[PDB]
Amino acid sequence: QIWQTDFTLEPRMAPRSWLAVTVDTASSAIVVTQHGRVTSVAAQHHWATAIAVLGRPKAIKTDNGSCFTSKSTREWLARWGIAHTTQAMVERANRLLKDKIRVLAEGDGFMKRIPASKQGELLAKAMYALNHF
Amino acid sequence: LQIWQTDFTLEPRMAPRSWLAVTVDTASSAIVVTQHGRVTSVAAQHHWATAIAVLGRPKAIKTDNGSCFTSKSTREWLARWGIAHTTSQGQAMVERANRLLKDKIRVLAEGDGFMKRIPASKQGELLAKAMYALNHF
Ligand SMILES: [Zn+2]
Ligand SMILES: [Zn+2]
Ligand SMILES: [Zn+2]
């Protein structure tokens, strides 16, 4: 598999409002996780989630953000045997995810921040809606 | 399918991220370890996603009653993954891995000249090398 990964902000999911999103380019499958800060660790724990869900890819493509080009991330991706190169599919995935998140939250009456106790199920439901799990 | 045991243990050499979450597969004795700054429900869930990535999905996970294992957020996560969960005794195999791992961490750090805290930029490769050495004796 060849994946594309990027981070995007979703303030309805605050305080853990940074979403890491990966898309598999051949299948269009999408995995998202939420994070309180954009760090190398956050990217690594997101990829371990995506691997657990979809299988281990041959290569991941990203932009040049510092979470993705750090010595830490470069070391992790070599340890896992995944090649790394430094858009349209991930951007499409972001918009579809944000839309689902907005309509589900506003439907439950949450017009601003979603309470932390409701976030885990609401993000899973948004993700499952865009997939064939 | 697989049955795991998981627990957290503190390792001050790996500070500030000195919380180690450890999972042992009961059939194969394989260990997966990740390190975390705080012991929270999310740290356990990201540890387990890592262990699924390395080992494959288990049928069941056994833990103690620490609050990050029995929280609503952890109960919901385990249910979404379809993993059964069983819970003040402890479990032998994970306590033994905790001991092996701390000994191993000490030996490796000390060979590289780190006598007390390991510099944060060294800790990822060293923890991975310790986990690999125990699995590949
Ligand atoms: Zn970006
Ligand atoms: Zn994490
Ligand atoms: Zn414990």
Numbering used by the authors:
A (entry chain A): 59 to 144, 153 to 199
B (entry chain B): 58 to 144, 150 to 199
Pull verbatim passages from the article behind this deposition.
The central CCD contains an invariant D,D(35)E motif, which forms a catalytic triad with two sites that can coordinate various divalent cations (Mg(II), Mn(II), Zn(II), Cd(II), Ca(II)) although Mg(II) is the likely metal cofactor in vivo. Rous-associated virus type 1 (RAV-1) is a replication-competent alpharetrovirus, member of ASLV subgroup A; the INs of this retrovirus genus are a good model for HIV IN.
Crystals were obtained in the presence of Zn(II) and MES at pH 6.0. They belonged to the hexagonal space group P61 and contained two molecules in the asymmetric unit. Moreover, helices α1 of monomers A and B now run almost parallel to the non-crystallographic two-fold axis and are locked together via a buried Zn(II) that coordinates the imidazole rings of His103A and His103B (left). The area of the buried surface at the new CCD/CCD interface, 740 Å2 per monomer, is similar to that previously observed in RSV-A IN; that is, 750 Å2 per monomer. The carboxylate group of Asp64 is situated at the centre of the triad and interacts with Asp121 through a Zn(II) ion from the crystallization solution.
